[PDB]
Amino acid sequence: VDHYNVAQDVVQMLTKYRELQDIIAVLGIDELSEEDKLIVDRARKLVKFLSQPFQVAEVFTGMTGHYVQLDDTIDSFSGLLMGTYDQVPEMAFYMVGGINSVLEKAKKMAEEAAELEKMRRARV
Protein backbone atom coordinates (compact mmCIF):
# COMPACT_ATOMS: atom_id res chain seq x y z
CA VAL A 1 0.00 0.00 0.00
CA ASP A 2 2.81 2.41 0.86
CA HIS A 3 4.40 1.76 -2.53
CA TYR A 4 1.13 2.49 -4.34
CA ASN A 5 0.34 5.66 -2.41
CA VAL A 6 3.84 7.09 -2.91
CA ALA A 7 3.81 6.37 -6.64
CA GLN A 8 0.45 8.07 -7.15
CA ASP A 9 1.55 11.11 -5.15
CA VAL A 10 4.70 11.42 -7.27
CA VAL A 11 2.67 11.20 -10.47
CA GLN A 12 0.23 13.85 -9.25
CA MET A 13 3.12 16.17 -8.38
CA LEU A 14 4.77 15.71 -11.77
CA THR A 15 1.45 16.14 -13.57
CA LYS A 16 0.84 19.49 -11.89
CA TYR A 17 4.40 20.67 -12.50
CA ARG A 18 4.00 20.01 -16.23
CA GLU A 19 0.91 22.22 -16.32
CA LEU A 20 2.70 24.94 -14.36
CA GLN A 21 5.69 24.63 -16.70
CA ASP A 22 3.63 26.15 -19.51
CA ILE A 23 3.15 29.35 -17.52
CA ILE A 24 6.76 29.33 -16.31
CA ALA A 25 8.29 29.36 -19.79
CA VAL A 26 6.17 32.20 -21.18
CA LEU A 27 5.94 34.66 -18.29
CA GLY A 28 8.46 33.45 -15.73
CA ILE A 29 8.86 31.41 -12.58
CA ASP A 30 8.30 34.49 -10.40
CA GLU A 31 4.75 35.17 -11.66
CA LEU A 32 3.31 32.15 -9.81
CA SER A 33 1.44 31.59 -6.58
CA GLU A 34 3.62 31.02 -3.54
CA GLU A 35 1.93 27.64 -3.15
CA ASP A 36 2.83 26.71 -6.73
CA LYS A 37 6.46 27.69 -6.09
CA LEU A 38 6.73 24.99 -3.41
CA ILE A 39 5.24 22.42 -5.78
CA VAL A 40 7.70 23.46 -8.49
CA ASP A 41 10.69 23.10 -6.17
CA ARG A 42 9.54 19.68 -4.97
CA ALA A 43 8.80 18.55 -8.53
CA ARG A 44 12.21 19.69 -9.77
CA LYS A 45 13.85 17.71 -6.97
CA LEU A 46 11.78 14.66 -7.92
CA VAL A 47 12.85 14.99 -11.55
CA LYS A 48 16.50 15.20 -10.53
CA PHE A 49 16.06 12.36 -8.03
CA LEU A 50 14.60 10.00 -10.64
CA SER A 51 17.95 10.06 -12.43
CA GLN A 52 20.34 7.29 -11.53
CA PRO A 53 23.94 6.41 -12.51
CA PHE A 54 23.96 2.96 -14.08
CA GLN A 55 26.77 0.47 -13.53
CA VAL A 56 26.86 -0.24 -17.28
CA ALA A 57 27.44 3.44 -18.13
CA GLU A 58 30.50 4.11 -15.96
CA VAL A 59 32.19 5.46 -19.10
CA PHE A 60 29.46 7.80 -20.33
CA THR A 61 28.59 8.94 -16.80
CA GLY A 62 32.10 8.85 -15.36
CA MET A 63 30.71 7.79 -11.97
CA THR A 64 30.25 4.52 -10.13
CA GLY A 65 26.81 3.01 -10.59
CA HIS A 66 24.19 2.34 -7.95
CA TYR A 67 21.71 -0.41 -7.12
CA VAL A 68 18.75 0.97 -5.17
CA GLN A 69 16.64 -1.48 -3.18
CA LEU A 70 12.91 -0.96 -3.56
CA ASP A 71 12.49 -0.33 0.17
CA ASP A 72 14.84 2.66 -0.09
CA THR A 73 13.14 3.93 -3.23
CA ILE A 74 9.82 4.05 -1.38
CA ASP A 75 11.16 5.58 1.84
CA SER A 76 13.33 8.18 0.10
CA PHE A 77 10.50 9.41 -2.12
CA SER A 78 7.92 9.31 0.67
CA GLY A 79 10.09 11.55 2.83
CA LEU A 80 10.73 13.92 -0.06
CA LEU A 81 6.99 14.38 -0.61
CA MET A 82 6.44 15.22 3.06
CA GLY A 83 8.93 18.07 2.66
CA THR A 84 11.51 17.04 5.26
CA TYR A 85 14.27 17.58 2.66
CA ASP A 86 13.26 21.06 1.48
CA GLN A 87 16.49 22.51 2.87
CA VAL A 88 18.61 20.13 0.77
CA PRO A 89 19.96 21.67 -2.47
CA GLU A 90 18.23 20.73 -5.70
CA MET A 91 21.38 19.42 -7.37
CA ALA A 92 22.06 17.02 -4.49
CA PHE A 93 19.40 14.72 -5.95
CA TYR A 94 21.06 14.62 -9.38
CA MET A 95 22.77 11.37 -10.42
CA VAL A 96 22.64 9.59 -7.07
CA GLY A 97 21.17 6.45 -5.56
CA GLY A 98 19.19 6.40 -2.33
CA ILE A 99 18.46 9.20 0.09
CA ASN A 100 21.72 8.50 1.93
CA SER A 101 23.70 9.30 -1.22
CA VAL A 102 21.69 12.51 -1.57
CA LEU A 103 22.65 13.59 1.94
CA GLU A 104 26.32 12.73 1.40
CA LYS A 105 26.40 14.75 -1.82
CA ALA A 106 24.68 17.63 -0.03
CA LYS A 107 27.31 17.46 2.71
CA LYS A 108 30.12 17.70 0.16
CA MET A 109 28.41 20.60 -1.60
CA ALA A 110 27.95 22.37 1.73
CA GLU A 111 31.62 21.85 2.59
CA GLU A 112 32.67 23.28 -0.78
CA ALA A 113 30.31 26.22 -0.32
CA ALA A 114 31.69 26.85 3.17
CA GLU A 115 35.23 26.77 1.80
CA LEU A 116 34.29 29.28 -0.90
CA GLU A 117 32.58 31.50 1.66
CA LYS A 118 35.66 31.30 3.88
CA MET A 119 37.91 32.25 0.96
CA ARG A 120 35.67 35.19 0.06
CA ARG A 121 35.47 36.37 3.67
CA ALA A 122 39.23 36.07 4.18
CA ARG A 123 39.71 38.23 1.08
CA VAL A 124 38.33 41.20 3.05
Binding site: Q87, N100, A114, R121
Partner: peptide, 30 residues
Amino acid sequence: EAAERNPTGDNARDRLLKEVLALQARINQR
Protein backbone atom coordinates in the same frame (compact mmCIF):
# COMPACT_ATOMS: atom_id res chain seq x y z
CA GLU B 1 2.51 10.59 36.60
CA ALA B 2 1.10 7.09 37.08
CA ALA B 3 2.75 6.22 33.75
CA GLU B 4 6.12 6.86 35.40
CA ARG B 5 5.42 4.24 38.07
CA ASN B 6 5.20 1.09 35.94
CA PRO B 7 6.88 2.32 32.73
CA THR B 8 18.85 2.14 13.69
CA GLY B 9 19.01 2.72 9.95
CA ASP B 10 16.63 5.67 10.17
CA ASN B 11 18.99 7.26 12.71
CA ALA B 12 21.74 7.48 10.10
CA ARG B 13 19.48 9.48 7.79
CA ASP B 14 18.57 11.81 10.66
CA ARG B 15 22.24 12.17 11.61
CA LEU B 16 23.25 13.06 8.06
CA LEU B 17 20.35 15.49 7.72
CA LYS B 18 21.31 17.24 10.96
CA GLU B 19 24.93 17.55 9.84
CA VAL B 20 23.93 18.99 6.46
CA LEU B 21 21.55 21.46 8.09
CA ALA B 22 24.30 22.46 10.53
CA LEU B 23 26.75 23.08 7.69
CA GLN B 24 24.20 25.11 5.72
CA ALA B 25 23.54 27.21 8.83
CA ARG B 26 27.24 27.66 9.64
CA ILE B 27 28.05 28.98 6.16
CA ASN B 28 25.28 31.56 6.60
CA GLN B 29 26.76 32.87 9.85
CA ARG B 30 30.23 33.60 8.46
